[PDB]
Ligand binder design. Structure first.
Ligand SMILES: CC(C)[C@@H](NS(=O)(=O)Cc1ccccc1)C(=O)N1CCC[C@H]1C(=O)NCc1ccc(C(=N)N)cc1
Ligand SMILES: CC(C)[C@@H](NS(=O)(=O)Cc1ccccc1)C(=O)N1CCC[C@H]1C(=O)NCc1ccc(C(=N)N)cc1
Ligand SMILES: *[C@@H]1O[C@H](CO)[C@@H](O)[C@H](O)[C@H]1NC(C)=O
Ligand code: NA
Ligand code: NA
Lengths: 11, 28, 251
């Protein structure tokens, strides 16, 4: 149920 | 560091939050 | 947080969310103590009985948050971890003695109205404030009940409890590196930290200098908000020499 976070933080 | 523990939206502008007084009242 | 209330905006600007990358979920609370250092509970990162052993690349730190689940565009900031440091005498085998860990961020976080560090106590402030009956404040996005989850950060104020009462409430061996807090059955009021609040701060506002100090870290409890049970917190001051050693060496 968490909103997706900008992919820049997942790289 | 030197500014630790002083909240921008509270202490910094001399506003109190809704329950901090409860803490103060316990400190006898 | 059980039997608490919604935090005000900017009420706890040192509050940190430890966030698992995959699956994306809340891992724990934590606190901001400088522009590069975050304090949390060791059990948030390492707890072998439950097969928990997170590495730096598994997690993110989300700072400046209010909503639990939203991506708070233009408000929250997300930081990557450079290194985790767990207390070398953290006792996960027995009773979570020395339940404390530090996390160094890859890059400094910018302070704002919503992001600001808490103070760590000196010996004198600890002696003055860590007394039975004196109230502190716990915040977090953890469970609303023992057995659901809040829309926004929750807050509750709770009194420190006399050591003998803490000890007599449990069969677990309590150490000087822990304190407990919460209301007694006969006090009427209630409230507690719970699962998910782990690693978050127990803070007190000094009446001497009007600054907030982090006296405890949410560590453990038998269920949540049970009559006759109390929440247990890592005693931050007792472990401050370790904190300073880590920051001095690696900071
Ligand atoms: C098996 C033994 C190592 C011990 N495990 S324990 O309590 O989970 C160890 C522990 C972990 C974290 C913080 C404090 C203490 C345990 O179960 N004890 C040690 C003292 C007596 C008994 C007990 O009743 N503990 C309280 C307790 C245990 C389990 C739960 C649960 N619902 N999982 C709750 C309370
Ligand atoms: C004491 C030990 C037996 C254990 N108790 S417990 O009942 O399983 C904790 C728990 C787990 C899930 C849902 C509610 C409560 C415990 O607290 N542990 C086992 C290992 C880690 C630590 C923990 O879960 N800490 C999170 C926590 C939970 C409750 C409180 C509280 N103040 N009530 C605080 C921290
Ligand atoms: C936890 O992970 C580290 C690194 O992968 C590993 O070296 C260690 O043995 C693991 N178990 C611990 C610290 O108990
Ligand atoms: Na006991
Ligand atoms: Na209780």
């Amino acid at each position: 149920d968490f909103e997706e976070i900008p992919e820049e933080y997942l790289q | 560091e030197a500014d630790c523990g002083l909240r921008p939206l509270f202490e910094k502008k001399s506003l109190e939050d809704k329950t901090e007084r409860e803490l103060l009242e316990s400190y006898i | 947080i059980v039997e608490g209330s919604d935090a005000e905006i900017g009420m706890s600007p040192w509050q940190v969310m430890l966030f698992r990358k995959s699956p994306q979920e809340l891992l724990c609370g934590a606190s901001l103590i400088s522009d590069r250092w975050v304090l949390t509970a060791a059990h948030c990162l390492l707890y072998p009985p439950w097969d928990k052993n997170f590495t730096e690349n598994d997690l993110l730190v989300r700072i400046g948050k209010h909503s639990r689940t939203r991506y708070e565009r233009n408000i929250e900031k997300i930081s990557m971890l450079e290194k985790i440091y767990i207390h070398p005498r953290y006792n996960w085998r027995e009773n979570l003695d020395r339940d404390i860990a530090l996390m160094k961020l890859k890059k400094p976080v910018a302070f704002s109205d919503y992001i600001h560090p808490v103070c760590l106590p000196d010996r004198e402030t600890a002696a003055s404030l860590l007394q039975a009956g004196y109230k502190g404040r716990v915040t977090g996005w953890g469970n609303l009940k023992e057995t659901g989850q809040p829309s926004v950060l929750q807050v509750v104020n709770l009194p420190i409890v006399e050591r003998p009462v803490c000890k007599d409430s449990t069969r677990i061996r309590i150490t000087d590196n822990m304190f407990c807090a919460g209301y007694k059955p006969d006090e009427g009021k209630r409230g507690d930290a719970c699962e998910g609040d782990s690693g978050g701060p127990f803070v007190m506002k000094s009446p001497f200098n009007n600054r907030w100090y982090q006296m405890g870290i949410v560590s453990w409890g038998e269920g949540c908000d049970r009559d006759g049970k109390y929440g247990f917190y890592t005693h931050v001051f007792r472990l401050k020499k370790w904190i300073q050693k880590v920051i001095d060496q690696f900071g």
